[PDB]
C-alpha cells in the first residue's frame, strides 16, 4: 500500500508499568504507480465502470504508459483470452490520468481485478490486484419465520415442551442463490421478588436508654439492640 503507516507501541513492564508510545508515522510512496479504486460491492450482470488512476509524481518528466486490463472469465470486458484491451497514453509531469474500464460481473462471490502498466524507454512498471464482492441481483430480505416463547411447566408437559417451526417461504427467491436460517436463543429475567425494608425514619423511637431492675433493664435494652441490628443489615443509617 502507498500511504503512511501509523505504528503504535505499548509497553508492559513488571517494574515501571504500562505506557503507550507516541504514533510513529512511516510514509511509503513511489514515483509512478496505479491507484485502482473499486466499490465495496457490485451487482451481478450489471455493467459498471471502475476507475484506474495512474499517478506521475516525477518533477519534470512526462511518461509514455501502456496500461492494460488482464482477462478474467468472472468479468466481461473488451479483453478476451486472445485479445488484450490496452491503451497507450502520455501522462504529463506532476499529474495523474484516469483510465475508464467497463466490465460486467458474470458470477457472484469475491472476484479479482488486476491492472498493469509500463512506461516507454524506462525501467519502471506497476500493477494492482485488488478484489471486490459481487452481490447477487435482487434485494436483501429477512422473513421472520416465528417468535416462540420458551417456558416449561407453564406451556409444557411432564417438564418438557415441544415447538415445531415450519420452513421459510422463499417463494420469490432469486434463481440460483443461497440462503441461511439464523436460529436464535436467549434467556430473560425473570428477576423479581425481593421486598422493601422498613424505613429507618420509622425507627427513630427504638433508641431507648436501658434502665430498671433485672427485668426492666432488658425491656429497655431490647428496642435499642434489635434496632441497630436491623439498621446494620439494611444499611439505613443514612436516612436515619
Amino acid at each position: 500500500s502507498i500511504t503512511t503507516w501509523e505504528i503504535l507501541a505499548v509497553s508492559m513492564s513488571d517494574k515501571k508499568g504500562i505506557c503507550v508510545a507516541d504514533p510513529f508515522e512511516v510514509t511509503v510512496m513511489q514515483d509512478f504507480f496505479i491507484d485502482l479504486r473499486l466499490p465495496y460491492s457490485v451487482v451481478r450482470n450489471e455493467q459498471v465502470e471502475i476507475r484506474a488512476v495512474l499517478y506521475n509524481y516525477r518533477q519534470n518528466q512526462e511518461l509514455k504508459v501502456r496500461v492494460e486490463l488482464l482477462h478474467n472469465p468472472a468479468f466481461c470486458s473488451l479483453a478476451t483470452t486472445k485479445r488484450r484491451h490496452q491503451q497507450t497514453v502520455t501522462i504529463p509531469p506532476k499529474s495523474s490520468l484516469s483510465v475508464p474500464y467497463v466490465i460486467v460481473p458474470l458470477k457472484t462471490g469475491l472476484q479479482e481485478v488486476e491492472v498493469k502498466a509500463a512506461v516507454y524507454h524506462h525501467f519502471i512498471s506497476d500493477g494492482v490486484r485488488k478484489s471486490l464482492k459481487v452481490v447477487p441481483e435482487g434485494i436483501r430480505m429477512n422473513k421472520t419465520v416465528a417468535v416462540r416463547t420458551l417456558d416449561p411447566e407453564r406451556l409444557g408437559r411432564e417438564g418438557v415442551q415441544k415447538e415445531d417451526i415450519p420452513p421459510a417461504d422463499l417463494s420469490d427467491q432469486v434463481p440460483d442463490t443461497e440462503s441461511e436460517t439464523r436460529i436464535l436463543l436467549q434467556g430473560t429475567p425473570v428477576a423479581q421478588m425481593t421486598e422493601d425494608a422498613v424505613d429507618a425514619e420509622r425507627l427513630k423511637h427504638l433508641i431507648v436508654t436501658p434502665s430498671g431492675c433485672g427485668e426492666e433493664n432488658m425491656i429497655g435494652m431490647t428496642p435499642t439492640v434489635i434496632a441497630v441490628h436491623y439498621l446494620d443489615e439494611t444499611e439505613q443509617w443514612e436516612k436515619f
Binding site: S1, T3, V10, V20, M29, Y40
Partner: protein, 640 residues
C-alpha cells in the same frame, strides 16, 4: 492523658495493600500495637492481622500494610464495609472504613476503529491494579451488538501472561451495522465494567484526507468579518490534492441541527488548499431571531467535501462544536479550594481556558478587590493568585476577571466563587496553611512545601513538629515529620518529586497540642498539586534507517524500539486512511491517567470545614484515643 491516633484511606481496596499510619501523643516507652481487620456487619474474624511496636526513636510512628481478600464472601446493591481495629496495648481504637470491591483498571485496545462485515477484530486487554502494574486476574469479556445485547462472553485469566490478553472476534458477513461494544470487568468486581466501542460498516479507504480548521477556535458574535474556515486537503502519502470543494455551514442547538442552505459555497482547491468565508449576514438570516445575543451559547458546524478532477474519490469532512461566546476565554475555580483561614493568605488556582476547552497561554488575571496583583497564566492554563483574608467569620467571595489587553472589558470573562471559614476546635483560632510555589512540576525536580502557622504564644512552643502525608492514586506514598522550634512561623520542606507522584498528589499536614484547658486540639490542612502527566518509564519508536529518502512498497526497514527493560512491547500498524472515517476511541496515555485521576478517593481541591473534614476531603481517616475521629464515608464515589 495519652492519645492513640490512626489514619487510613477513606475507601479501602481489595486485593491490594493499604497503608495504615499509627501514632501516639504522647506517652513514653514502648507501646505494642495489634491491628486487626474484621468484616461488617458482624465481627467475623479474621481478614488481616498485623503487629508493630512504637519506639520513641521513630517519634512514635507505625507503618503497617495489610492486604484485604478476596474472599468470595463479598458479593448486589448497597455497599460493603470493614471494621478496622487497632489496639494500643489496652486502649482500643476502632473505625469502620468503606470498601471498594474494585480490583484495578482494564484497558481495551482494538487494532482498528472501524471494521467491514467479514473481517476480524483484533483486540487485547490489559489487566493492571490501582498502581498500573501487570497483575494476574480473572476477567469477564462480553461483546454487545449495536442493540446492546451480548453475543459473546468469555472468562480469561491474565495469570502468567504478564497482564496481556490477546483476543479476536470474527465478524460474520451478515451482521448488523452500527456501533458495537466490547465490555470487560474483573470477576471480583462485576460492578466496575470498562468498555470500548468499534464501528461496523461497509466502507472504502479514501486516497486523501480532508481537514477543516477555522481561523479561530471560536466565533465572536459582533465579528463583522464572519467565520473564516480553512480547507486543507492532501493525499495519505503527503502529496497535495487538486480538486474542488463543497462547503456548507449550520447552527447546532441543544442536540439539534438547523442546516443553513444559504451558506453553500464552491471553492476550488488549488495547490492542496482552499479558503471559504461565512458572511455574518447569512448567519443571522439563518435563525428567525433578530437579536444576535440569542445565538450566544450555541455552536456552528462545517461540512466540506473534496472531489478530485478525475472524479475517482470523494471525501467528506466536518468540524462541529464551534463555541459562539462573547469572551475568547473562560474561568474555572475547580482547582481552587472552597475553604479559607480567617486572617491567613488565601491562594487561588485560576484555571483559564479557551472556548473549546484547550488551556490558555499567558493570560493576565486579577481580582476585583486589589489591583496590580496579577499573574500571567502558565502553559497548563493555570494562574497563581493570593488575596488576603480577614479574621472575620464572614463567607469569602472572590470575583476574578481577565485584564487581557487588546480587548474591551465587555468582551472579557468573569467567574465568582465562595469559600467557607475553617471551624476551629474551641474557637482557639489555631489554623494552618500550606502555600506551594505553583510551577509545572516534573519527575526528578524538587518542591518547596511551606508550613504557615497561626496561633497565640500561649501554646506556640508546644508545636515542635508537623505530620505530612503523601496521597497518590488513592494510597499513602510517604509520611514523615517536619521539625519546628518555637519562634518559627514558616518552615520549608525539601520534597523530592519522583515518578510515583504522577499524575497528581495531595499533601496533608497536621499538628497536635494541649490548648485551652487540658483540651486536645487537632488542626490540619490539605493541598492538591498536579505533576506533568507522562509515562512512568519511557517508550520511543523511531526509524532505524539513516534518514535517506522514503521507503518503497515492498521494502525492508529497521524499526528501532527504545523501551524499558524486561518490558513486553505489543505493536500494531494501521493505515492513516482508517482514521479518516473514524479517529475515536484511540488508546492514549492521556486517557490512561484520565481514568486514574477520576478515581481518587479525594474530592475537595484542598482544606475543609474542620479538622475532621480536611482528612475526609483528602482521602484519610484520622482517629485517636482521645475521641477525635474523622467523618464516616458510606458512598464509594464522591458526593454530587
Amino acid at each position: 492523658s495519652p492519645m492513640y491516633s490512626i489514619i487510613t484511606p477513606n475507601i479501602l481496596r481489595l486485593e491490594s495493600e493499604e497503608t495504615m499510619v499509627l501514632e501516639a501523643h504522647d506517652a513514653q516507652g514502648d507501646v505494642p500495637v495489634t491491628v486487626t481487620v474484621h468484616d461488617f456487619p458482624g465481627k467475623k474474624l479474621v481478614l488481616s492481622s498485623e503487629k508493630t511496636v512504637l519506639t520513641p526513636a521513630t517519634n512514635h510512628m507505625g507503618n503497617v500494610t495489610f492486604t484485604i481478600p478476596a474472599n468470595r464472601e463479598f458479593k448486589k446493591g448497597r455497599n460493603k464495609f470493614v471494621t478496622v481495629q487497632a489496639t494500643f496495648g489496652t486502649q482500643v481504637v476502632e473505625k469502620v472504613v468503606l470498601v471498594s470491591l474494585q480490583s484495578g483498571y482494564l484497558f481495551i485496545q482494538t487494532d482498528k476503529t472501524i471494521y467491514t462485515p467479514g473481517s476480524t477484530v483484533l483486540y487485547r486487554i490489559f489487566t493492571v491494579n490501582h498502581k498500573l502494574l501487570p497483575v494476574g486476574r480473572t476477567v469477564m469479556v462480553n461483546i454487545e451488538n449495536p442493540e446492546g445485547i451480548p453475543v459473546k462472553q468469555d472468562s480469561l485469566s491474565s495469570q502468567n501472561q504478564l497482564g496481556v490478553l490477546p483476543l479476536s472476534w470474527d465478524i460474520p458477513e451478515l451482521v448488523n451495522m452500527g456501533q458495537w461494544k466490547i465490555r470487560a470487568y474483573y470477576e471480583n468486581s462485576p460492578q466496575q465494567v470498562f468498555s470500548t466501542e468499534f464501528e461496523v460498516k461497509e466502507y472504502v479507504l479514501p486516497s486523501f484526507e480532508v481537514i477543516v480548521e477555522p481561523t479561530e477556535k471560536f466565533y465572536y458574535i459582533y465579528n463583522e468579518k464572519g467565520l473564516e474556515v480553512t480547507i486543507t486537503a492532501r493525499f495519505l502519502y503527503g502529496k497535495k490534492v487538486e480538486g474542488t470543494a463543497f462547503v456548507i455551514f449550520g447552527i447546532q442547538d441543544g442536540e439539534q441541527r438547523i442546516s443553513l442552505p444559504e451558506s453553500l459555497k464552491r471553492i476550488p482547491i488549488e495547490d492542496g488548499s482552499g479558503e471559504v468565508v461565512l458572511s455574518r449576514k447569512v448567519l443571522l438570516d439563518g435563525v428567525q431571531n433578530p437579536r444576535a445575543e440569542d445565538l450566544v451559547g450555541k455552536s456552528l458546524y462545517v461540512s466540506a467535501t473534496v472531489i478530485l478532477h478525475s472524479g475517482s474519490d470523494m471525501v467528506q469532512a466536518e468540524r462541529s462544536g464551534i463555541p459562539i461566546v462573547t469572551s475568547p476565554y473562560q474561568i474555572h475555580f475547580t482547582k481552587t479550594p472552597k475553604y479559607f483561614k480567617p486572617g491567613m493568605p488565601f491562594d487561588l488556582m485560576v484555571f483559564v481556558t479557551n472556548p473549546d476547552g484547550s488551556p490558555a497561554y499567558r493570560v493576565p488575571v486579577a481580582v476585583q478587590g486589589e489591583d496590580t496583583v496579577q499573574s500571567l497564566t502558565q502553559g497548563d492554563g493555570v494562574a497563581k493568585l493570593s488575596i488576603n483574608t480577614h479574621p472575620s467569620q464572614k463567607p469569602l467571595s472572590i470575583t476574578v476577571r481577565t485584564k487581557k489587553q487588546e480587548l474591551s472589558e465587555a468582551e472579557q470573562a468573569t467567574r465568582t466563587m465562595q469559600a467557607l471559614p475553617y471551624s476551629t476546635v474551641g474557637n482557639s483560632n489555631n489554623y494552618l496553611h500550606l502555600s506551594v510555589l505553583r510551577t509545572e512540576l516534573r519527575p526528578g525536580e524538587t518542591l518547596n512545601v511551606n508550613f504557615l502557622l497561626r496561633m497565640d504564644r500561649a501554646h506556640e512552643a508546644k508545636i515542635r513538629y508537623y505530620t505530612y502525608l503523601i496521597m497518590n492514586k488513592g494510597r499513602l506514598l510517604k509520611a514523615g515529620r517536619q521539625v519546628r522550634e518555637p519562634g518559627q512561623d514558616l518552615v520549608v520542606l525539601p520534597l523530592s518529586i519522583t515518578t510515583d507522584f504522577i499524575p497528581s498528589f495531595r499533601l496533608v499536614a497536621y499538628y497536635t497540642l494541649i490548648g485551652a484547658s487540658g483540651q486536645r486540639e487537632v488542626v490540619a490542612d490539605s493541598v492538591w498539586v498536579d505533576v506533568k502527566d507522562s509515562c512512568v518509564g519511557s517508550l520511543v519508536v523511531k526509524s532505524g534507517q539513516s534518514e535517506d529518502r522514503q521507503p518503497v512498497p515492498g521494502q525492508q526497514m529497521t524499526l528501532k524500539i527504545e523501551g524499558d527493560h524486561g518490558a513486553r512491547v505489543v505493536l500494531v500498524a494501521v493505515d492513516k486512511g482508517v482514521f479518516v472515517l473514524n479517529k475515536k476511541n484511540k488508546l492514549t496515555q492521556s486517557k490512561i491517567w484520565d481514568v486514574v485521576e477520576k478515581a481518587d478517593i479525594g474530592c475537595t481541591p484542598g482544606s475543609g470545614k474542620d479538622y475532621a473534614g480536611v482528612f475526609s476531603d483528602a482521602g484519610l481517616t484520622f482517629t485517636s484515643s482521645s475521641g477525635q475521629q474523622t467523618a464516616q464515608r458510606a458512598e464509594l464515589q464522591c458526593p454530587q
